[PDB]
Design a binder for these strands. Structure first.
Ligand SMILES: [Mg+2]
Ligand SMILES: [Mg+2]
Ligand SMILES: [Mg+2]
Ligand SMILES: [Mg+2]
Ligand SMILES: [Mg+2]
Ligand SMILES: [Mg+2]
Ligand SMILES: [Mg+2]
Ligand SMILES: [Mg+2]
Ligand SMILES: [Mg+2]
Ligand SMILES: [Mg+2]
Ligand SMILES: [Mg+2]
Ligand SMILES: [Mg+2]
Ligand SMILES: [Mg+2]
Ligand SMILES: [Mg+2]
Ligand SMILES: [Mg+2]
Ligand SMILES: [Mg+2]
Ligand SMILES: [Mg+2]
Ligand SMILES: [Mg+2]
Ligand SMILES: [Mg+2]
Ligand SMILES: [Mg+2]
Ligand SMILES: [Mg+2]
Ligand SMILES: [Mg+2]
Ligand SMILES: [Mg+2]
Ligand SMILES: [Mg+2]
Ligand SMILES: [Mg+2]
Ligand SMILES: [Mg+2]
Ligand SMILES: [Mg+2]
Ligand SMILES: [Mg+2]
Ligand SMILES: [Mg+2]
Ligand SMILES: [Mg+2]
Ligand SMILES: [Mg+2]
Ligand SMILES: [Mg+2]
Ligand SMILES: [Mg+2]
Ligand SMILES: [Mg+2]
Ligand SMILES: [Mg+2]
Ligand SMILES: [Mg+2]
Ligand SMILES: [Mg+2]
Ligand SMILES: [Mg+2]
Ligand SMILES: [Mg+2]
Ligand SMILES: [Mg+2]
Ligand SMILES: [Mg+2]
Ligand SMILES: [Mg+2]
Ligand SMILES: [Mg+2]
Ligand SMILES: [Mg+2]
Ligand SMILES: [Mg+2]
Ligand SMILES: [Mg+2]
Ligand SMILES: [Mg+2]
Ligand SMILES: [Mg+2]
Lengths: 185, 339, 134
RNA sequence: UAUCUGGUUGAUCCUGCCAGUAGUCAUAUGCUUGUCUCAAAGAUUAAGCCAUGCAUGUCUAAGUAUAAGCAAUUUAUACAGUGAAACUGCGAAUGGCUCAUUAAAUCAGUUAUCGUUUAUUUGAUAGUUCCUUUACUACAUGGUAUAACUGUGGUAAUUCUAGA
RNA sequence: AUUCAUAAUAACUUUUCGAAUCGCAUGGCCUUGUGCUGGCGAUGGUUCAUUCAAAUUUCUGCCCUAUCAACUUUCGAUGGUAGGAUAGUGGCCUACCAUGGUUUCAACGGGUAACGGGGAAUAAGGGUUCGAUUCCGGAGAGGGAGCCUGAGAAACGGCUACCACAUCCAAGGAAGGCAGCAGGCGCGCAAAUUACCCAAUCCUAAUUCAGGGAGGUAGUGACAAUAAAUAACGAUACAGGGCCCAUUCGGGUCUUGUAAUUGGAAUGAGUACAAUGUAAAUACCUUAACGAGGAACAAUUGGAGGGCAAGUCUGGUGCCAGCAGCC
C-alpha cells in the first residue's frame, strides 16, 4: 500500500542479431564517439524512434490543428535547444529526417573534445568521469550529458582537480613529498 | 567477564541410559519446599548452588565451601552400547567428570575404555558408585548423609560393604589406580577418592556433592577465572515447533546475546547463522498443556542452551561454536571440520 | 575557513508558530560542508535572537562540492522553541535530555503482562504467599 | 514501430509445417558479479498444519477516588494536587491478509428509493409532565445494589472464581 | 408524478422524549432572608435536516462447451389476493387461487489449473495473450450452522454446537484457530528477519499526551527498472603509410599504429577523523588520513560448418566417447 515508483527503459535492441553492415556501422559510431556499449547506440536509436513516431503522428494531422501546433512546436523548440535540430530546418519534417549522429554529436563526452580541451574522445571520457570539467560551478560526470547549447560557452575544467587550479592531488603531491624527503632532510 | 562455574559430566554405567542420580537431586528439591516450576536446561542440567545448600545437611562438619562457586551444570551422555559415542563429546566432556561403578562388580564391559579415555586426557574425575540397595538386608533414610546411615545399618551389612569394597578396589588397582574412601582420603592427587552413593534412595548423595566442590577448589582456583570470548561446542541436533529447528550447545565461557552472529560448522563449507531465538531452559509441571521452554534475551555462560537459527541444519558433534569476527574464524572452522 | 557565506532564501514570518522559517543556502568553496552548530551561532546573530532559539536541519551538500542547501527556523524566544520544536531536535542541540526507556517490545511485553492482572496486585502477592505453604 | 532465414528434389516452382529469429511487470534454474539510485518478494503446489512472541485498546478543567497509594503544602474539617485498581463511556464492524468459493453471480459504466435503516460530524429543534383541582405532591434535589477493596476459601491446571 | 411535506378531528399506549449531570469564574440587586438573580462551556436529549455509511435496485456487457435440447413447479417454478415477517420493496415466507416462466438471438446442464474491474505484455493497422498481486468492488478467516453485543457483525486476534485437526493433566478436567507481523513444518521448480520506531503517513479513544507488526526503519534480496568503473596521457627502439626531391643512399616532418626496457600523472572500489544523515542507528551526498602497475583492485557468459558474427590452426578420439532447437 504505497504508490508505484514508475520506471521504463531507455533502449531497444535490433530485430536482426548478426547483420555485418549494421555491426560495422555501429562499431564505427562507437569508435568515433568513444562509447563502450552497442547499448549506447541502441539507446539513441530508441530515443530517435519515439521522436520520429510522434512526428509522423502530428504530421498526419491537419495543418493548423491545435494539437499539431502546440505539441509540434514544443517538440521542435525542445530539439533546437540541445542542438540536434539546425535552425534552418526548424519545422518537423527535418526532425522526421534527423538521424542518430545529430544526437551523438551533442553529448558532453563529445563537446569536451570538440572544443579541444581533450584531443581524443577517450581522453574526453576519462576526463569527465574523473570529476574535472563542469558546466557552471556544477561538476558533471556523465558522458551522455547532452550539452544544452546555451551552456556550450560554459564547458571548462572545474574549480577543483588540477586543470582548473586548486591542487595537483595525491600522486603528484606524493612525488613532491619524495623530492623534499629524499633530497633534503 | 565470567568466573567459570564447574562443568562436570557424569560418565559410565550401562542400562541406565540416564543415570537416576541427578534426577534424584531435582526430585528431592521439588516436593518439600519450592516456589514454582523449576528451570531445567536440556542436554545439560543446571542447578543454582542454592539448591545444593538446601540439599545437604552437614555431616557435622565434613561441605560449606560456597565462597565463589555458583553451582553446577552437570552434563550426561551414556546409554549405548555402542561403546561408545560417549567418548570425546567435545573437549569439555572432558573437564571434571563423575565415573560411577557397580556395587556388585565394579566393572562393566565399556568401563575399561571409559576410564582409559579419561587417563589419556589426564583430567581429574571422581569415582562414585550407584545404588547400594540391590544389596542384602538394607534399610533407607531418604537424602541422609552416608555416614549417618552407615553406622545405623547392622554389622553384617557393614562388613559386606567392606568386603565388596576391597573387591572394587582390587579390580580398580589392576586397571591402574590407587584410591580409597573419600572421608578416609589422604590427599587428592595422592589417591582417587571414592564416595559410595545410593541412587535409589538417597544415601550420601549430598556428600558426593561435598566432594565435588572440594575437588573443584583443589585443582581449580586460579583456573576458574576467565575473561574469555564466547567458547562453546555443538552437542546435538534436533527439531522443535513454535520457533523451529535447533542445535543444543554448551557455552563454557562468554556472555551470549540474541542478536549475535555466530559462525558454525557445516561440512559443505563454513556456515554462519543469525540466532533466531535462544531457547532453553524450561520450568516444571505440565500435564498435557501450556508453555514448554522459556525464552531468554541474553545469557551468562556456563549454561547449556538450545540455539534456534534460520539456516541451521547440518552440524556435527565435535564442532566449535563461536561468535563472529568473520575472516580468521571462517578459515578456522573450515580446517577443523575436516578432522 | 574560506569565508563561507550564509544566505537565507524564501523567508516567511510565521506568527501562528512564533518563528521565522526559511531555506538556508550555504556556499562554502574550499571547505567541505559547514556544521549545524556554526550555522545556529551565525544566524543567532542576524535575527538578534541567540543560538538556543534557532533550529536548523534538512541539509545536503550539492553534488560535486561547495554548496549545501538546508532549512532553518528562528523563534521569537527560547521558550517558544522549547515548546514548538521537535523534542529530538532539542536533544540534538543541548536543550533537552534523551530520557531513554526500555525497548519498544520490552515495553509492549510489560503491558501484556500487566493485562493478566486485575486490580492492584500486591493483593495477589499476598495470595500467592499462601500457595507457598500447602 | 509494414524485413524474414535453414530443412522435402538430381535440379525446379509450389503447398505445408518443423527449426531459427526478437520481447515479456514471466517464472524457474545455471554460470558470473565492483559502484549509484530505485525495491518485488510463500500467489501458482496444500483457503495444507502451526511451537513462541508481538499485532486493541482508551481520560479532558469538565461521569465515579476514604488506595489503609504518592505528594505534601499551601487556605479549604464534605470534596478539591496527583493517581493504581475498578465502575462508567467509547472503540474493537476500521486496519491488515488471502483469492477458496462465485459464470447473469460478482464486477463495470449507468440508474432507482414516490422502497428503507443510519452511531457519528455539522445545522436546527422542546414554557404543557402532578391532580376530583383549599387544608398537598422531597425539587434546597427522592431509592438500593455492586465493583474495586477488606477479609475467609476451593482446584494439578486458564484472564476459573465461591461464601462473608 | 403521490394518500408528499405540514396540519385538523376522535380515541389508543405494561407511555417515548421533555436535564435529579459536570467544569471554570464569582458578579450583580433589595423589603438584607446567605433572598431573588446571574457569566463563559461540558456532557446529555426528542424530532428534522446534513455528513459518513448501508440495503436493495434499472439498462447493457462475461471464458470453453451440443460426445449438454429442452429447462423450471421434492419441498415456489411464473403471476393474482390477503396476511406474516423485514429497516423496508419483493414468493422473502404462509394461506387460498390460477397455469404460468426460459429457450437455436443457445435456455438448462457441464467445465474453468474463473474472484471482477482499474490495468499488463506484444508496437504498421485489425488483433492476440494475461490480470493471485500496491487503487476500487466482492468474499473468507480449518469446514458448516447458529447467535449475543451493538449505530453497524450473521464478526471469528466474539461466543455456541456439530465435523475434521490439535494441546495441557495429578485422568477429575481444562484449554486452541497466523488467508495479521515475524518465525517453523509440509508442499514443491518456485519466494526474505522469531531485528528497530511511532520520527513521518494517517487511524482510534474520554483524547495535543496513550495505543497502533497499520505504517515507517534497517536486515535478507542479480524479481523487474536507472546511471555506468575494470583505465587515460607523453617519450624512446625501430617499422611503416604519407609527402616534397629521388641523380639512387633516404629519412624527416606530419603521423598511423605493432612494441618483452620507459616516464611521470588521475581517480573511486575499499579503508577511515569529522560533520551531515536518522526516532536512534546504517547507507547515500560531503570530506582530513590512507588507497593501482600486471602477482592486480586481474569480467563474464555462450559461440566460431549452415541458418548466424567468428579458423579449414595444433594436439586427442576413431560411427567410440560426445555434439547437434533444425539441416
Ligand atoms: Mg575529491
Ligand atoms: Mg509502548
Ligand atoms: Mg490496567
Ligand atoms: Mg522445406
Ligand atoms: Mg534433409
Ligand atoms: Mg516433392
Ligand atoms: Mg538432397
Ligand atoms: Mg541423378
Ligand atoms: Mg532450423
Ligand atoms: Mg517456432
Ligand atoms: Mg573487478
Ligand atoms: Mg543514482
Ligand atoms: Mg515454508
Ligand atoms: Mg502475496
Ligand atoms: Mg497457498
Ligand atoms: Mg487524594
Ligand atoms: Mg469500558
Ligand atoms: Mg436490588
Ligand atoms: Mg454573590
Ligand atoms: Mg450530542
Ligand atoms: Mg403475492
Ligand atoms: Mg417486505
Ligand atoms: Mg404447470
Ligand atoms: Mg411451457
Ligand atoms: Mg452455441
Ligand atoms: Mg478459484
Ligand atoms: Mg485481480
Ligand atoms: Mg480474468
Ligand atoms: Mg488462484
Ligand atoms: Mg453498488
Ligand atoms: Mg489454514
Ligand atoms: Mg463467523
Ligand atoms: Mg488470527
Ligand atoms: Mg478481525
Ligand atoms: Mg464435512
Ligand atoms: Mg487429581
Ligand atoms: Mg504469518
Ligand atoms: Mg497486525
Ligand atoms: Mg526467486
Ligand atoms: Mg520465512
Ligand atoms: Mg504516528
Ligand atoms: Mg512492522
Ligand atoms: Mg505491516
Ligand atoms: Mg543486502
Ligand atoms: Mg588513490
Ligand atoms: Mg593495479
Ligand atoms: Mg571463453
Ligand atoms: Mg559466417
Amino acid at each position: 500500500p504505497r504508490a508505484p515508483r514508475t520506471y521504463s527503459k531507455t533502449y531497444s535492441t535490433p530485430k536482426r542479431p548478426y547483420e555485418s553492415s549494421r555491426l560495422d556501422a555501429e562499431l564505427k559510431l562507437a569508435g568515433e564517439f568513444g562509447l563502450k556499449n552497442k547499448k549506447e547506440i541502441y539507446r539513441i536509436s530508441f530515443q530517435l524512434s519515439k521522436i520520429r513516431r510522434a512526428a509522423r503522428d502530428l504530421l498526419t494531422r491537419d495543418e493548423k490543428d491545435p494539437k499539431r501546433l502546440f505539441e509540434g512546436n514544443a517538440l521542435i523548440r525542445r530539439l533546437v535547444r540541445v542542438g540536434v535540430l539546425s535552425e534552418d530546418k526548424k519545422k518537423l519534417d527535418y526532425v522526421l529526417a534527423l538521424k542518430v549522429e545529430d544526437f551523438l554529436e551533442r553529448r558532453l563526452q563529445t563537446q569536451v573534445y570538440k572544443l579541444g580541451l581533450a584531443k581524443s574522445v577517450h581522453h574526453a571520457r576519462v576526463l569527465i568521469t574523473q570529476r574535472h570539467i563542469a558546466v557552471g560551478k556544477q561538476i558533471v560526470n556523465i558522458p551522455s550529458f547532452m550539452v544544452r547549447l546555451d551552456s556550450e560557452k560554459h564547458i571548462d575544467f572545474a574549480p577543483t582537480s588540477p586543470f582548473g587550479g586548486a591542487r595537483p592531488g595525491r600522486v603528484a603531491r606524493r612525488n613532491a613529498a619524495r623530492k623534499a624527503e629524499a633530497s633534503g632532510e | 567477564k565470567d568466573l567459570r562455574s564447574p562443568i562436570c559430566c557424569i560418565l559410565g554405567h550401562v542400562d541406565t541410559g540416564k543415570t537416576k542420580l541427578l534426577d534424584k537431586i531435582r526430585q528431592t528439591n521439588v516436593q518439600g519446599g519450592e516456589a514454582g516450576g523449576i528451570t531445567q536446561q536440556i542436554g545439560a542440567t543446571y542447578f543454582p548452588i542454592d539448591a545444593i545448600k538446601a540439599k545437604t545437611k552437614v555431616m557435622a562438619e565434613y561441605e560449606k565451601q560456597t565462597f565463589d562457586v555458583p553451582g553446577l551444570l552437570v552434563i550426561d551422555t551414556p546409554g549405548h552400547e555402542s561403546f561408545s559415542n560417549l567418548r570425546s563429546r567435545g573437549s569439555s566432556l572432558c573437564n571434571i567428570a563423575i565415573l560411577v561403578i557397580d556395587i556388585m562388580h565394579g566393572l562393566e564391559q565399556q568401563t575399561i575404555e571409559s576410564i582409559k579415555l579419561l587417563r589419556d586426557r589426564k583430567a581429574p574425575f571422581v569415582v562414585a558408585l550407584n545404588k547400594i540397595d540391590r544389596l542384602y538386608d538394607w534399610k533407607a533414610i531418604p537424602n541422609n548423609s552416608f555416614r549417618d546411615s552407615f553406622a545405623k545399618q547392622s554389622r553384617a551389612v557393614q562388613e559386606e560393604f567392606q568386603s565388596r569394597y576391597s573387591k572394587i578396589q582390587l579390580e580398580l588397582a589392576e586397571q591402574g589406580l590407587n584410591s580409597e574412601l573419600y572421608f578416609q582420603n589422604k590427599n587428592m592427587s595422592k589417591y582417587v577418592s571414592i564416595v559410595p552413593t545410593s541412587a535409589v534412595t538417597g544415601e550420601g548423595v549430598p556428600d558426593l556433592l561435598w566432594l565435588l566442590l572440594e575437588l573443584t577448589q583443589k585443582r581449580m582456583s586460579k583456573q576458574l577465572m576467565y575473561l574469555s570470548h564466547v567458547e562453546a561446542t555443538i552437542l546435538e541436533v534436533k527439531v522443535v515447533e513454535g520457533f523451529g529447528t535447533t542445535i543444543d550447545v554448551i557455552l563454557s565461557n562468554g556472555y551470549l546475546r540474541e542478536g549475535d552472529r555466530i559462525v558454525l560448522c557445516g561440512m559443505n563449507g563454513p556456515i554462519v547463522t543469525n540466532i533466531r531465538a535462544l531457547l532453553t531452559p524450561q520450568p516444571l509441571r505440565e500435564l498435557r498443556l501450556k508453555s514448554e521452554y522459556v525464552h531468554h534475551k541474553e545469557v551468562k555462560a556456563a549454561l547449556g542452551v538450545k540455539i534456534a537459527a534460520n539456516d541451521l541444519e547440518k552440524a556435527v558433534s565435535g564442532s566449535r561454536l563461536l561468535v563472529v569476527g568473520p575472516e580468521d574464524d571462517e578459515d578456522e572452522l573450515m580446517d577443523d571440520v575436516m578432522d | 575557513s574560506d569565508a563561507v557565506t550564509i544566505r537565507t532564501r524564501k523567508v516567511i514570518s510565521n506568527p501562528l508558530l512564533a518563528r521565522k522559517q526559511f531555506v538556508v543556502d550555504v556556499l562554502h568553496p574550499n571547505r567541505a560542508n559547514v556544521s549545524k552548530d556554526e550555522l545556529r551561532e551565525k544566524l543567532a546573530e542576524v535575527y538578534k535572537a541567540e543560538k538556543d532559539a534557532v533550529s536548523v536541519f534538512g541539509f545536503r551538500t550539492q553534488f560535486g562540492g561547495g554548496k549545501s542547501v538546508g532549512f532553518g527556523l528562528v523563534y521569537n524566544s527560547v521558550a517558544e522553541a522549547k515548546k514548538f520544536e521537535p523534542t529530538y531536535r532539542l536533544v540534538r542541540y543541548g536543550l533537552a535530555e534523551k530520557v531513554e526507556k526500555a525497548s519498544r517490545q520490552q515495553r509492549k511485553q510489560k503491558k501484556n503482562r500487566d493485562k493478566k492482572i486485575f486490580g492492584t496486585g500486591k493483593r495477589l502477592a499476598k495470595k500467592v504467599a499462601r500457595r507457598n505453604a500447602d
